Amino acid sequence: AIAYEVTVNGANLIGAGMAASGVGVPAIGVAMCFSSYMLAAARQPNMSAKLLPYCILGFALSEALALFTLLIALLELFVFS
Amino acid sequence: AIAYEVTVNGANLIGAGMAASGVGVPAIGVAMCFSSYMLAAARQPNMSAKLLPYCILGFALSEALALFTLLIALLELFVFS
Amino acid sequence: AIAYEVTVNGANLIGAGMAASGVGVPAIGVAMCFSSYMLAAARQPNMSAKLLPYCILGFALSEALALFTLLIALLELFVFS
Amino acid sequence: AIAYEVTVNGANLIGAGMAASGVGVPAIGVAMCFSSYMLAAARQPNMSAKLLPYCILGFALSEALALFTLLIALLELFVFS
Amino acid sequence: AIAYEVTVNGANLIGAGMAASGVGVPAIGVAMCFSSYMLAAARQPNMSAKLLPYCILGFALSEALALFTLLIALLELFVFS
Amino acid sequence: AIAYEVTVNGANLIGAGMAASGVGVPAIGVAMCFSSYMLAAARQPNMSAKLLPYCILGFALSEALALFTLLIALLELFVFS
Amino acid sequence: AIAYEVTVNGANLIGAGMAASGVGVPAIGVAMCFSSYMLAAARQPNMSAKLLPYCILGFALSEALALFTLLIALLELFVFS
Amino acid sequence: AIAYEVTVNGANLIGAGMAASGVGVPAIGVAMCFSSYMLAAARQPNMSAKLLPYCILGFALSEALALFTLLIALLELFVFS
Amino acid sequence: AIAYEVTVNGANLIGAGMAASGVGVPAIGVAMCFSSYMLAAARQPNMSAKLLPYCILGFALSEALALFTLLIALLELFVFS
Amino acid sequence: AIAYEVTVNGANLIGAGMAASGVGVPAIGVAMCFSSYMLAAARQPNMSAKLLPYCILGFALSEALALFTLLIALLELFVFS
Amino acid sequence: KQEPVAAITIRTNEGEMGVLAGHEYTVQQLAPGILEVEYEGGKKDQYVISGGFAHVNDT
């Protein structure tokens, strides 16, 4: 059997877009958190001050997931040849 | 075994087309916020002033991810040969 | 190892078919915004004047993302060789 | 370092499929908008005429995103060789 | 440089599938419109006759987008050599 | 420039798979329609005969889109070489 | 110009995976067609038996769509080279 | 025309991924079928005994779709050359 | 007719990613299940115990699918050459 | 026939993108969970203490799925040649 | 008349609801059925009703 190693340098710059396509999905979670806090606050203003920590936490985790999805791409390109 | 490095110069102009697919995905995750603010202000208009910050706050970040999905597509093409 | 640079001219175009896939996805966030305005005014008509601004705002920004997703797909063909 | 420039004439067409995949997504926004108008009229018929302009606006703009996507898919064929 | 023009005749019969992926996306919106008409007539039967013209209207326009998608899959095979 | 026409035969099938991927999305519209009919009839059983026609209509329409998509998936193997 | 028929036998076994991505989707319709019924029975126990036929109907039709999607994948392999 | 037959041993394993992409989707049809039992049971506990026969049924059949969508991913690897 | 068998050792590492994308989708069914439990308990706290098992049960099943969608991506890499 | 082995090193840096697409979707599960906690607490704060652990569990396992996906995108790159 | 109560359970057309302390302000019909009151002592009291309107408070 013959052996042909091949190195597509340009594949450095294809997989980054496939991560960038998923950088934006967690936004749907983000607003879905804040969108809830309003409605809850609409139904119970007295609880508005006790729900905000859980809101910020959900936001932070969604943002961090997007951040890792983006960190792959920024790590995919700016170091790999 | 034999070694063939290849440099596909068109791959640059492919990942941008795949990254940009995710620039609109935050949009549903953006207007979800304002829509929820309308629903809350319709439920409790009195609370509207206390709800507008969080709304804007969500929009300040849900949209940002879109930019981080667009930046790649504009950082992928115009600088990589 | 051997150096095979290749310049694919078809990748001038394939990406425009991919970014264009993400030009429609803002439209749902659009229609969500307007639908929310309708349902809010149906829940509180007299507030309909105060909710219409926010609607437009979210709308435009959602649409703006589409435009950028539409910019690339038109920035990718009419100039790139 | 060798240079193989390749002109793929069939990539004229593959992208024309992918762009078409985005032409349907605005339809769910159109339906969301008309659904909202229906349900608001069922909540408050006195607001039937006041809300209809916003319904037409949202439908027009979702349809316009779909139209630009279809324009890419067709322009990608009937002028490009 | 060297110039290899390639005419891939099989890409004739690839994008036709990709477009066919999006022909079904309008159907969920279609069903949304009819679902909304049902629930609106339930909340207020008296308005049923007044809401039907939009319902039908909404369907057609949603379907139109799917149709154009399908047309590409029929315009990509039966005319392209 | 040099002219390499290639007839890739496997492309008779790779698109059919994609043509199958869109067959499933209309099922969500079918189910949404029957679900809406159920909920509306449960809110107003006396309307059950007046809403059942539009239900069947929505099913047939969504299923027609699925049939066209599947039609490509079967029109792409048994006739195309 | 030159003519090169390439017979990629392995493309037998790509679409069979691709189609499977659309085989699982109708479940979301399917379960919905059941999820409504419970709620209908929750909203009105007396109207359970009158609504069961439409439940089974939507179930069977969505499952048949999934079955026709799977038919391509299983037919793409065990008859095709 | 010339005849280059090829047998790709790697595409025996790409399609598995494309199939595994659709094994997680019917999970939604699981939750939507159990979640509905919760709220229904919350709205009418005395009906919980007769609603449960529907829940597990819809679940099982959705899971059947997922099982086939996975079965290709097992049938694509352990038997094919 | 000429015959070129080829053994691609890189496909080993691609399908896992394509499987990995389907690993995050069951998470939404997970959350749908637990959210349903929360809202049903809010509706009827006295039922909060009687609905707890189904929730867990539903979760596990969705999680099981993810495991399969994660099994392949781990069974595709660390055993295949 | 004839036997050509190939080793595409660039496939190392593609699937890590394909996996990263699915890292963002579980963020929706996280957000769905917290949004449910808010809209349950705002209906019955006395159950907040009883509903927070399940909510906690809800954003662990969901997140865990994403991590596995992300792990692959870190286990695909930093170990494979 | 203004009895301390731990919990209460009402029936409606949308379905059966359950109210506890600090429940959201909601006003809604009572479908003709049963009505369960649960005191802090764990006991219960069931009452049959003929329609009505339940007015809940945040306080």
CSV table of N, CA, C and O in Angstrom, one decimal, chain I residues 3-10 13-14 17-18 20-21 23-28 30-32 34-35 37-39 41-43 45 48 52 59 63 66 70 73-74 77-78, chain J residues 1-8 11-12 15 18-19 21-22 25-26 28-29 32-33 36-37 39-40 43-44 47 51 54-55 57-58 61-62 65 68-69 72 75-76 80:
chain,number,residue,atom,x,y,z
I,3,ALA,N,-9.3,1.0,-11.1
I,3,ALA,CA,-9.7,0.9,-9.7
I,3,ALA,C,-8.7,1.4,-8.7
I,3,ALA,O,-7.6,0.8,-8.5
I,4,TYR,N,-9.1,2.5,-8.0
I,4,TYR,CA,-8.3,3.1,-6.9
I,4,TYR,C,-9.0,3.0,-5.6
I,4,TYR,O,-10.0,3.7,-5.3
I,5,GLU,N,-8.5,2.0,-4.8
I,5,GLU,CA,-8.9,1.9,-3.4
I,5,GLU,C,-8.1,3.0,-2.6
I,5,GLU,O,-6.9,3.1,-2.8
I,6,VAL,N,-8.7,3.7,-1.7
I,6,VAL,CA,-8.1,4.7,-0.9
I,6,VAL,C,-8.5,4.5,0.6
I,6,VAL,O,-9.6,4.3,0.9
I,7,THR,N,-7.5,4.7,1.4
I,7,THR,CA,-7.7,4.6,2.9
I,7,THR,C,-7.4,6.0,3.5
I,7,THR,O,-6.2,6.3,3.7
I,8,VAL,N,-8.4,6.7,3.8
I,8,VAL,CA,-8.3,8.1,4.4
I,8,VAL,C,-8.2,7.9,5.9
I,8,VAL,O,-9.2,7.4,6.5
I,9,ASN,N,-7.1,8.3,6.5
I,9,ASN,CA,-7.0,8.2,8.0
I,9,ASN,C,-7.5,9.4,8.7
I,9,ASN,O,-7.5,9.4,10.0
I,10,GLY,N,-7.9,10.4,8.0
I,10,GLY,CA,-8.4,11.6,8.7
I,10,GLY,C,-9.9,11.6,9.0
I,10,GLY,O,-10.3,12.3,9.9
I,13,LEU,N,-11.2,11.3,12.4
I,13,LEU,CA,-11.3,12.4,13.3
I,13,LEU,C,-12.4,13.4,13.0
I,13,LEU,O,-12.5,14.4,13.7
I,14,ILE,N,-13.1,13.3,11.9
I,14,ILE,CA,-14.1,14.2,11.5
I,14,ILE,C,-15.5,13.9,12.0
I,14,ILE,O,-16.1,14.7,12.7
I,17,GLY,N,-16.6,14.9,15.6
I,17,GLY,CA,-17.1,16.3,15.7
I,17,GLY,C,-18.5,16.4,15.2
I,17,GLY,O,-19.4,17.0,15.9
I,18,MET,N,-18.9,15.7,14.1
I,18,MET,CA,-20.2,15.7,13.6
I,18,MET,C,-21.2,15.0,14.5
I,18,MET,O,-22.3,15.3,14.6
I,20,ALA,N,-20.4,15.0,17.8
I,20,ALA,CA,-20.3,15.8,19.0
I,20,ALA,C,-21.3,17.0,19.0
I,20,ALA,O,-21.8,17.4,20.0
I,21,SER,N,-21.6,17.5,17.8
I,21,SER,CA,-22.6,18.5,17.6
I,21,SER,C,-24.0,18.1,18.2
I,21,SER,O,-24.7,18.9,18.8
I,23,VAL,N,-24.5,16.2,20.6
I,23,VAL,CA,-24.4,15.8,22.1
I,23,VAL,C,-25.1,16.9,22.9
I,23,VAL,O,-25.6,16.6,24.0
I,24,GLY,N,-25.1,18.1,22.5
I,24,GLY,CA,-25.7,19.2,23.2
I,24,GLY,C,-27.2,19.4,23.1
I,24,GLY,O,-27.8,20.1,23.8
I,25,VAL,N,-27.8,18.7,22.1
I,25,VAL,CA,-29.2,18.8,21.8
I,25,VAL,C,-30.1,18.2,22.9
I,25,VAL,O,-31.1,18.8,23.3
I,26,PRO,N,-29.8,17.0,23.4
I,26,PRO,CA,-30.6,16.5,24.5
I,26,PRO,C,-30.6,17.3,25.8
I,26,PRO,O,-31.6,17.2,26.5
I,27,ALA,N,-29.7,18.2,26.0
I,27,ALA,CA,-29.7,19.1,27.1
I,27,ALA,C,-30.9,20.0,27.1
I,27,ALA,O,-31.4,20.4,28.2
I,28,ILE,N,-31.5,20.3,25.9
I,28,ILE,CA,-32.7,21.2,25.9
I,28,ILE,C,-33.9,20.3,26.4
I,28,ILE,O,-34.8,20.9,27.0
I,30,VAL,N,-33.6,17.8,28.6
I,30,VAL,CA,-33.3,17.8,30.0
I,30,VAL,C,-34.0,19.0,30.7
I,30,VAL,O,-34.8,18.9,31.6
I,31,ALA,N,-33.6,20.2,30.2
I,31,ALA,CA,-34.1,21.4,30.8
I,31,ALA,C,-35.6,21.5,30.7
I,31,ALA,O,-36.3,22.0,31.6
I,32,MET,N,-36.2,21.1,29.5
I,32,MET,CA,-37.6,21.1,29.4
I,32,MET,C,-38.3,20.2,30.4
I,32,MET,O,-39.3,20.6,31.0
I,34,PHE,N,-37.0,19.3,33.6
I,34,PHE,CA,-36.9,19.9,34.9
I,34,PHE,C,-37.7,21.2,35.1
I,34,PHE,O,-38.3,21.4,36.1
I,35,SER,N,-37.8,22.0,34.0
I,35,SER,CA,-38.6,23.2,34.0
I,35,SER,C,-40.1,22.8,34.2
I,35,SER,O,-40.9,23.5,34.9
I,37,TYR,N,-41.2,20.2,35.7
I,37,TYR,CA,-41.3,19.8,37.1
I,37,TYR,C,-41.5,21.1,38.0
I,37,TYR,O,-42.4,21.1,38.8
I,38,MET,N,-40.7,22.1,37.8
I,38,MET,CA,-40.8,23.3,38.6
I,38,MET,C,-42.2,23.9,38.4
I,38,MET,O,-42.8,24.3,39.4
I,39,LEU,N,-42.6,24.1,37.2
I,39,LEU,CA,-43.9,24.8,37.0
I,39,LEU,C,-45.1,24.0,37.5
I,39,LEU,O,-46.0,24.5,38.0
I,41,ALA,N,-44.9,21.9,40.0
I,41,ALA,CA,-44.9,22.0,41.5
I,41,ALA,C,-45.5,23.4,41.9
I,41,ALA,O,-46.2,23.4,42.9
I,42,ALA,N,-45.2,24.4,41.1
I,42,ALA,CA,-45.7,25.7,41.4
I,42,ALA,C,-47.3,25.7,41.3
I,42,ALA,O,-48.0,26.3,42.1
I,43,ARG,N,-47.8,25.0,40.3
I,43,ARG,CA,-49.2,24.9,40.2
I,43,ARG,C,-49.8,24.1,41.3
I,43,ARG,O,-50.7,24.5,42.0
I,45,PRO,N,-48.2,22.2,44.6
I,45,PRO,CA,-47.1,21.7,45.5
I,45,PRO,C,-47.4,20.3,46.1
I,45,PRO,O,-46.4,19.5,46.3
I,48,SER,N,-45.8,17.7,44.2
I,48,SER,CA,-44.4,17.8,43.9
I,48,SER,C,-43.6,16.5,44.1
I,48,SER,O,-42.6,16.3,43.4
I,52,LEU,N,-42.0,13.9,40.8
I,52,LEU,CA,-40.6,13.9,40.8
I,52,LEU,C,-40.0,12.7,40.0
I,52,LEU,O,-39.0,12.9,39.3
I,59,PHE,N,-35.4,12.6,32.2
I,59,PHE,CA,-34.1,13.1,32.1
I,59,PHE,C,-33.1,12.0,31.6
I,59,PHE,O,-32.5,12.2,30.6
I,63,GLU,N,-30.7,11.8,28.5
I,63,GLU,CA,-29.3,11.8,28.8
I,63,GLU,C,-28.7,10.5,28.1
I,63,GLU,O,-27.6,10.6,27.5
I,66,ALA,N,-27.8,11.2,24.6
I,66,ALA,CA,-26.6,12.0,24.5
I,66,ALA,C,-25.4,11.1,24.7
I,66,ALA,O,-24.4,11.2,23.9
I,70,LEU,N,-22.5,10.6,22.3
I,70,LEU,CA,-21.1,10.8,22.8
I,70,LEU,C,-20.3,9.5,22.7
I,70,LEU,O,-19.1,9.5,22.7
I,73,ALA,N,-18.6,9.2,19.1
I,73,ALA,CA,-17.5,10.2,19.0
I,73,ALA,C,-16.3,9.8,19.9
I,73,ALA,O,-15.2,10.2,19.6
I,74,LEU,N,-16.5,8.9,20.9
I,74,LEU,CA,-15.4,8.3,21.6
I,74,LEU,C,-15.1,6.9,21.1
I,74,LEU,O,-13.9,6.5,21.2
I,77,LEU,N,-12.9,7.4,17.6
I,77,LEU,CA,-11.5,7.9,17.7
I,77,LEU,C,-10.5,6.9,18.3
I,77,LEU,O,-9.6,6.5,17.6
I,78,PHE,N,-10.8,6.5,19.5
I,78,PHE,CA,-9.7,5.9,20.3
I,78,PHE,C,-9.6,4.4,20.0
I,78,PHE,O,-8.8,3.7,20.7
J,1,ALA,N,-7.1,-4.1,-8.1
J,1,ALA,CA,-7.2,-2.7,-7.9
J,1,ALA,C,-5.8,-2.2,-7.4
J,1,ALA,O,-4.9,-2.9,-7.3
J,2,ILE,N,-5.8,-0.9,-7.0
J,2,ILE,CA,-4.5,-0.3,-6.5
J,2,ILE,C,-4.9,0.4,-5.2
J,2,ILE,O,-6.0,0.6,-4.9
J,3,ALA,N,-3.8,0.6,-4.3
J,3,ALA,CA,-4.0,0.9,-2.9
J,3,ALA,C,-3.3,2.2,-2.5
J,3,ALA,O,-2.0,2.1,-2.2
J,4,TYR,N,-4.0,3.3,-2.4
J,4,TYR,CA,-3.5,4.6,-1.9
J,4,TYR,C,-4.0,5.0,-0.5
J,4,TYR,O,-5.2,5.3,-0.3
J,5,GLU,N,-3.1,4.9,0.4
J,5,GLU,CA,-3.4,5.4,1.7
J,5,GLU,C,-3.1,6.9,1.8
J,5,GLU,O,-2.2,7.4,1.1
J,6,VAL,N,-3.9,7.7,2.5
J,6,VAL,CA,-3.7,9.1,2.7
J,6,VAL,C,-3.9,9.4,4.2
J,6,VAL,O,-4.8,8.9,4.8
J,7,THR,N,-3.2,10.4,4.6
J,7,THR,CA,-3.3,10.9,6.0
J,7,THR,C,-3.4,12.4,5.9
J,7,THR,O,-2.5,13.1,5.7
J,8,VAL,N,-4.7,12.9,6.0
J,8,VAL,CA,-5.0,14.3,6.0
J,8,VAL,C,-4.8,14.9,7.4
J,8,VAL,O,-5.6,14.6,8.3
J,11,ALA,N,-7.6,17.4,8.9
J,11,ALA,CA,-8.8,16.9,9.5
J,11,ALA,C,-8.7,17.1,11.1
J,11,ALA,O,-9.8,17.1,11.7
J,12,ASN,N,-7.5,17.2,11.6
J,12,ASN,CA,-7.4,17.5,13.0
J,12,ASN,C,-8.1,18.8,13.4
J,12,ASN,O,-8.8,18.8,14.4
J,15,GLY,N,-13.0,19.0,12.7
J,15,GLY,CA,-14.0,18.5,13.5
J,15,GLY,C,-14.1,19.3,14.8
J,15,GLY,O,-15.2,19.4,15.4
J,18,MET,N,-16.6,21.6,14.0
J,18,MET,CA,-17.9,20.9,13.9
J,18,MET,C,-18.5,20.6,15.3
J,18,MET,O,-19.7,20.7,15.5
J,19,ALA,N,-17.6,20.2,16.2
J,19,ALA,CA,-18.1,20.0,17.6
J,19,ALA,C,-18.5,21.3,18.3
J,19,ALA,O,-19.5,21.3,19.0
J,21,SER,N,-19.8,23.8,17.2
J,21,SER,CA,-21.2,24.3,16.9
J,21,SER,C,-22.2,23.9,17.9
J,21,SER,O,-23.1,24.6,18.3
J,22,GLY,N,-22.1,22.6,18.4
J,22,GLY,CA,-23.0,22.1,19.4
J,22,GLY,C,-22.7,22.4,20.8
J,22,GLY,O,-23.4,21.9,21.7
J,25,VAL,N,-25.7,25.1,22.2
J,25,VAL,CA,-27.1,24.8,22.3
J,25,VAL,C,-27.4,24.5,23.8
J,25,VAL,O,-28.5,24.9,24.2
J,26,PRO,N,-26.6,23.8,24.6
J,26,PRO,CA,-27.0,23.5,26.0
J,26,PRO,C,-27.2,24.8,26.8
J,26,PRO,O,-27.8,24.8,27.8
J,28,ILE,N,-29.1,27.1,26.0
J,28,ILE,CA,-30.5,27.2,26.0
J,28,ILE,C,-31.2,26.4,27.1
J,28,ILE,O,-32.1,26.8,27.7
J,29,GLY,N,-30.6,25.2,27.3
J,29,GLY,CA,-31.1,24.4,28.4
J,29,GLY,C,-30.9,25.0,29.7
J,29,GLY,O,-31.8,25.0,30.6
J,32,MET,N,-33.4,27.9,29.9
J,32,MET,CA,-34.8,27.4,30.1
J,32,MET,C,-35.0,27.0,31.5
J,32,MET,O,-36.0,27.3,32.1
J,33,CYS,N,-34.0,26.4,32.1
J,33,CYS,CA,-34.0,26.0,33.5
J,33,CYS,C,-34.2,27.2,34.4
J,33,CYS,O,-35.1,27.2,35.3
J,36,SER,N,-37.5,28.9,34.1
J,36,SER,CA,-38.5,28.2,34.7
J,36,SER,C,-38.5,28.4,36.2
J,36,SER,O,-39.6,28.5,36.9
J,37,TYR,N,-37.3,28.5,36.8
J,37,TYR,CA,-37.2,28.7,38.3
J,37,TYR,C,-37.9,30.1,38.6
J,37,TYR,O,-38.6,30.2,39.6
J,39,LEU,N,-40.2,31.8,36.9
J,39,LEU,CA,-41.6,31.9,36.7
J,39,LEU,C,-42.3,30.9,37.6
J,39,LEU,O,-43.6,30.9,37.6
J,40,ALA,N,-41.6,30.0,38.3
J,40,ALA,CA,-42.2,29.2,39.3
J,40,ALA,C,-42.2,30.0,40.7
J,40,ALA,O,-43.2,30.0,41.4
J,43,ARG,N,-44.6,32.5,41.0
J,43,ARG,CA,-46.0,32.0,41.2
J,43,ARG,C,-46.1,31.5,42.6
J,43,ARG,O,-47.2,31.6,43.2
J,44,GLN,N,-45.1,31.0,43.2
J,44,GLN,CA,-45.1,30.5,44.6
J,44,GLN,C,-43.7,30.5,45.2
J,44,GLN,O,-43.0,29.6,45.2
J,47,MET,N,-42.1,27.7,47.4
J,47,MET,CA,-41.5,26.5,46.8
J,47,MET,C,-40.2,26.8,46.2
J,47,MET,O,-39.5,25.9,45.8
J,51,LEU,N,-37.4,24.2,45.0
J,51,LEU,CA,-37.2,24.1,43.5
J,51,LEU,C,-35.8,24.5,43.1
J,51,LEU,O,-35.4,24.1,41.9
J,54,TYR,N,-33.3,21.3,42.1
J,54,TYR,CA,-33.6,20.7,40.8
J,54,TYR,C,-33.0,21.6,39.7
J,54,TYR,O,-32.3,21.2,38.8
J,55,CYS,N,-33.3,22.9,39.9
J,55,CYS,CA,-32.8,24.0,39.0
J,55,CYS,C,-31.2,23.8,39.0
J,55,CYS,O,-30.6,23.8,37.9
J,57,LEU,N,-29.4,21.2,39.6
J,57,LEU,CA,-29.1,20.0,38.9
J,57,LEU,C,-29.4,20.2,37.4
J,57,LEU,O,-28.5,19.8,36.5
J,58,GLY,N,-30.4,21.0,37.0
J,58,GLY,CA,-30.7,21.2,35.7
J,58,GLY,C,-29.6,21.9,34.9
J,58,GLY,O,-29.3,21.6,33.7
J,61,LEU,N,-26.0,19.1,34.5
J,61,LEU,CA,-25.9,18.0,33.6
J,61,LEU,C,-25.9,18.6,32.1
J,61,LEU,O,-25.1,18.2,31.3
J,62,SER,N,-26.9,19.5,31.9
J,62,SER,CA,-26.9,20.2,30.6
J,62,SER,C,-25.5,20.8,30.3
J,62,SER,O,-24.9,20.4,29.3
J,65,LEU,N,-22.9,18.2,29.3
J,65,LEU,CA,-22.9,17.7,28.0
J,65,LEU,C,-22.1,18.7,27.1
J,65,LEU,O,-21.2,18.2,26.4
J,68,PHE,N,-18.4,18.1,27.5
J,68,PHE,CA,-17.9,16.9,26.7
J,68,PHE,C,-17.7,17.3,25.3
J,68,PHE,O,-16.6,17.0,24.7
J,69,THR,N,-18.6,18.0,24.7
J,69,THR,CA,-18.5,18.5,23.3
J,69,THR,C,-17.2,19.3,23.2
J,69,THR,O,-16.3,19.1,22.4
J,72,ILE,N,-14.1,17.4,23.4
J,72,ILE,CA,-13.7,16.7,22.2
J,72,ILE,C,-12.9,17.7,21.3
J,72,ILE,O,-11.8,17.4,20.8
J,75,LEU,N,-9.8,17.7,22.9
J,75,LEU,CA,-9.2,16.4,22.8
J,75,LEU,C,-8.9,16.0,21.4
J,75,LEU,O,-8.2,15.1,21.1
J,76,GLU,N,-9.5,16.8,20.4
J,76,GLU,CA,-9.3,16.5,19.0
J,76,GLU,C,-8.0,17.2,18.6
J,76,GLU,O,-7.2,16.6,17.8
J,80,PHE,N,-3.9,14.9,18.8
J,80,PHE,CA,-3.8,14.2,17.6
J,80,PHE,C,-2.8,14.9,16.7
J,80,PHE,O,-2.7,16.2,16.7
